[PDB]
Design a protein around this motif. Structure first.
Motif, mmCIF file in Angstrom:
data_model
loop_
_atom_site.group_PDB
_atom_site.id
_atom_site.type_symbol
_atom_site.label_atom_id
_atom_site.label_comp_id
_atom_site.label_asym_id
_atom_site.label_seq_id
_atom_site.Cartn_x
_atom_site.Cartn_y
_atom_site.Cartn_z
ATOM 1 N N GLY B 141 12.384 58.663 -51.771
ATOM 2 C CA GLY B 141 12.835 57.696 -51.140
ATOM 3 C C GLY B 141 12.199 57.048 -50.044
ATOM 4 O O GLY B 141 12.514 56.138 -49.195
ATOM 5 N N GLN B 142 10.803 57.652 -49.839
ATOM 6 C CA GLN B 142 10.308 57.089 -48.857
ATOM 7 C C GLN B 142 9.366 56.067 -48.913
ATOM 8 O O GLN B 142 9.044 55.463 -50.305
ATOM 9 C CB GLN B 142 9.173 58.181 -48.408
ATOM 10 N N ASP B 143 8.796 55.276 -48.044
ATOM 11 C CA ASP B 143 8.073 54.032 -48.114
ATOM 12 C C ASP B 143 6.838 54.269 -48.532
ATOM 13 O O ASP B 143 6.226 53.165 -48.752
ATOM 14 C CB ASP B 143 7.960 53.548 -46.521
ATOM 15 N N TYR B 144 6.116 55.496 -48.461
ATOM 16 C CA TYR B 144 4.659 55.583 -48.966
ATOM 17 C C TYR B 144 4.657 56.628 -50.055
ATOM 18 O O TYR B 144 5.609 57.557 -50.541
ATOM 19 C CB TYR B 144 3.791 56.135 -47.749
ATOM 20 N N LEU B 145 3.644 56.505 -50.914
ATOM 21 C CA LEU B 145 3.753 57.179 -52.006
ATOM 22 C C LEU B 145 3.531 58.703 -51.678
ATOM 23 O O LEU B 145 4.230 59.567 -52.196
ATOM 24 C CB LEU B 145 2.285 56.997 -52.920
ATOM 25 N N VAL B 146 2.590 59.181 -50.529
ATOM 26 C CA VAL B 146 2.508 60.314 -50.256
ATOM 27 C C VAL B 146 2.445 60.908 -48.753
ATOM 28 O O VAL B 146 1.930 60.032 -47.945
ATOM 29 C CB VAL B 146 1.021 60.768 -50.766
ATOM 30 N N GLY B 147 3.192 61.840 -48.314
ATOM 31 C CA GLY B 147 3.154 62.249 -46.999
ATOM 32 C C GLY B 147 4.087 61.543 -45.919
ATOM 33 O O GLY B 147 4.043 61.581 -44.730
ATOM 34 N N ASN B 148 4.774 60.366 -46.607
ATOM 35 C CA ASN B 148 5.267 59.550 -45.641
ATOM 36 C C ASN B 148 4.803 58.681 -44.863
ATOM 37 O O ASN B 148 5.017 58.562 -43.523
ATOM 38 C CB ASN B 148 6.597 60.291 -44.918
ATOM 39 N N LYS B 149 3.574 58.286 -45.199
ATOM 40 C CA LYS B 149 2.526 57.764 -44.284
ATOM 41 C C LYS B 149 1.606 56.849 -44.993
ATOM 42 O O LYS B 149 1.403 57.293 -46.283
ATOM 43 C CB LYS B 149 1.793 58.933 -43.463
ATOM 44 N N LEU B 150 0.957 55.823 -44.778
ATOM 45 C CA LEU B 150 -0.153 55.072 -45.523
ATOM 46 C C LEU B 150 -1.188 55.909 -45.962
ATOM 47 O O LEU B 150 -1.648 56.654 -45.098
ATOM 48 C CB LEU B 150 -0.587 53.841 -44.494
ATOM 49 N N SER B 151 -1.614 55.698 -47.252
ATOM 50 C CA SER B 151 -2.426 56.461 -47.785
ATOM 51 C C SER B 151 -3.287 55.699 -48.790
ATOM 52 O O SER B 151 -3.015 54.338 -49.195
ATOM 53 C CB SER B 151 -2.322 57.575 -48.442
ATOM 54 N N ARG B 152 -4.514 55.986 -48.919
ATOM 55 C CA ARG B 152 -5.499 55.064 -50.205
ATOM 56 C C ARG B 152 -4.566 54.713 -51.252
ATOM 57 O O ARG B 152 -4.895 53.783 -52.148
ATOM 58 C CB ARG B 152 -6.653 55.753 -50.476
ATOM 59 N N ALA B 153 -3.568 55.605 -51.834
ATOM 60 C CA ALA B 153 -2.838 55.505 -52.820
ATOM 61 C C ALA B 153 -2.017 54.303 -52.783
ATOM 62 O O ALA B 153 -2.034 53.732 -53.659
ATOM 63 C CB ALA B 153 -2.200 56.747 -53.333
ATOM 64 N N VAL B 158 -1.122 49.104 -54.820
ATOM 65 C CA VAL B 158 -0.637 47.579 -54.447
ATOM 66 C C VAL B 158 -1.931 46.482 -54.956
ATOM 67 O O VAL B 158 -1.458 45.462 -55.649
ATOM 68 C CB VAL B 158 -0.159 47.155 -52.939
ATOM 69 N N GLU B 159 -3.067 46.939 -54.831
ATOM 70 C CA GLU B 159 -4.138 46.227 -55.205
ATOM 71 C C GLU B 159 -3.820 45.652 -56.990
ATOM 72 O O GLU B 159 -4.212 44.752 -57.428
ATOM 73 C CB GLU B 159 -5.525 46.805 -55.086
ATOM 74 N N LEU B 160 -3.642 46.977 -57.835
ATOM 75 C CA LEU B 160 -3.388 46.943 -59.044
ATOM 76 C C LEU B 160 -2.271 46.055 -59.379
ATOM 77 O O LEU B 160 -2.259 45.277 -60.281
ATOM 78 C CB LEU B 160 -3.209 48.280 -59.507
ATOM 79 N N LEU B 161 -1.149 46.081 -58.581
ATOM 80 C CA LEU B 161 0.246 45.319 -58.579
ATOM 81 C C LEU B 161 -0.307 43.921 -58.950
ATOM 82 O O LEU B 161 0.211 42.953 -59.555
ATOM 83 C CB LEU B 161 1.219 45.482 -57.612
ATOM 84 N N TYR B 162 -1.098 43.348 -57.977
ATOM 85 C CA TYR B 162 -1.655 41.743 -57.750
ATOM 86 C C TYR B 162 -2.447 41.560 -59.043
ATOM 87 O O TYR B 162 -2.283 40.510 -59.773
ATOM 88 C CB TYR B 162 -2.838 41.542 -56.558
ATOM 89 N N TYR B 163 -3.044 42.450 -59.883
ATOM 90 C CA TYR B 163 -4.097 42.321 -61.103
ATOM 91 C C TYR B 163 -3.021 42.245 -62.143
ATOM 92 O O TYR B 163 -3.094 41.301 -63.056
ATOM 93 C CB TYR B 163 -5.143 43.136 -61.489
ATOM 94 N N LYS B 182 5.191 46.815 -52.939
ATOM 95 C CA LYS B 182 4.272 45.479 -52.818
ATOM 96 C C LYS B 182 4.501 44.632 -51.714
ATOM 97 O O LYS B 182 3.598 44.201 -51.031
ATOM 98 C CB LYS B 182 4.281 44.796 -54.243
ATOM 99 N N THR B 183 5.793 44.444 -51.469
ATOM 100 C CA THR B 183 6.273 43.604 -50.511
ATOM 101 C C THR B 183 5.866 44.191 -49.129
ATOM 102 O O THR B 183 5.070 43.672 -48.210
ATOM 103 C CB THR B 183 7.732 43.215 -50.414
ATOM 104 N N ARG B 184 6.170 45.394 -48.894
ATOM 105 C CA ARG B 184 6.107 46.091 -47.745
ATOM 106 C C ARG B 184 4.623 46.238 -47.170
ATOM 107 O O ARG B 184 4.214 45.954 -46.115
ATOM 108 C CB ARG B 184 6.554 47.672 -47.680
#
Lengths: 208, 206
Positions: B141-153, B158-163, B182-184
């Motif tokens: 339910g977290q905003d980030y894929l890993v660790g509850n924090k922005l990461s390279r993942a 999200v780059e892939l979501l644009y493609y 994607k939005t966030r």
């Protein structure tokens, strides 16, 4: 705690580089071979495979898939990934070269017979002119026994794994690269690697 | 400043642009326009395996995309907090790199293969990749894929979501948490700026 468990076909393919690495590091591990279409379906249905594919490695509570995610984890845990970020950058660059050349050889079995002998020529050319020269040069840059930081890393293990496959393909390719020849000897004599090369180990044969 | 040596296109260097820009890092580009620009890189010894991408960074000349991206992610603290988080990051982004490689090589597919390849991609997006990332977001339910924090993942996904949106905008539609990510992420100040006209972000190929 739990031994690592490796889930793959009983073959080299995409799990061979992990077997080498674990064996190099003196880590004991178990295998679980995928015998049939139903065994792989079982893995998928039990939710064991994030992307519906093996290699998968059950290790320290995780079910890691993607060869690179598995190798990277094992390399850090057993101090075979250099001692800092910069060292990790050299290692990465080396091993990704090795992975690229490796990829070509790994896939040559499933070329079209039409394309096969240009592909082999192309491979042999890259080895002689691109890959073996770059590593020979690394080794010659420092004259030390290992590729990075003057101690055993994953780079040496992956390089030496590849030098075995190159030999099988054409044992003349390495002959004008003396430092690579010596690296292969030194690494193959390390206790853990000497044991892995001995009969009876998890090391796998070429496909038929 | 890091200096990125590539063609003036996305190819294998666009993921690095995304990552640096996401991390708020300024970089230079030195574009390769002539076969002879590439010769000079080679003869000057700048390329270990005779190929770009190459990034001149922190006094190294790093080649290979994964090596360049590995170094950046750690240096700017986008590679999680420990080896176990890095292993989840790794698993996620290598899956993302697998899908991305398929989409990246599509332009250069033999024409007689193109149709089947596109349909196999969409099938993989629908049944393999998007469900797996939706699953991860759903589990915590977290905003980030890993660790509850922005990461390279997050950035790479999200780059892939644009493609994928370029390929077919209906593909994300049954994946609401992916849409939300994607939005966030596109709203983070660094990413929002990257995505704005005028940034080093590159266009799709002709």
């Amino acid at each position: 705690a739990e031994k690592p468990k490796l889930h793959y076909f009983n073959a080299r393919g995409r799990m061979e580089s992990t077997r080498w690495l674990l064996a190099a590091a003196g880590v004991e591990f178990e295998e679980k071979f995928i015998k049939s279409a139903e065994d792989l379906d079982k893995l998928r249905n039990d939710g064991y495979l994030m992307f519906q594919q093996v290699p998968m490695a059950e290790i320290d509570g995780m079910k890691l898939v993607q060869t690179r995610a598995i190798l990277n984890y094992i390399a850090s845990k057993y101090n075979l990934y250099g001692k800092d970020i910069k060292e990790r950058a050299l290692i990465d660059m080396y091993i990704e070269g090795i992975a690229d050349l490796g990829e070509m050889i790994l896939l040559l079995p499933v070329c079209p017979p039409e394309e096969k002998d240009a592909k082999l020529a192309l491979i042999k050319e890259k080895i002689k002119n691109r890959y073996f020269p770059a590593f020979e040069k690394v080794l010659k840059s420092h004259g030390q026994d290992y590729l990075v930081g003057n101690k055993l890393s994953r780079a040496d293990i992956h390089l030496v794994e590849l030098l075995y496959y190159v030999e099988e393909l054409d044992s003349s390719l390495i002959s004008s690269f003396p430092l690579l020849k010596a690296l292969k000897t030194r690494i193959s004599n390390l206790p853990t690697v000497k044991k892995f090369l001995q009969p009876g180990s998890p090391r796998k044969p070429p496909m038929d």
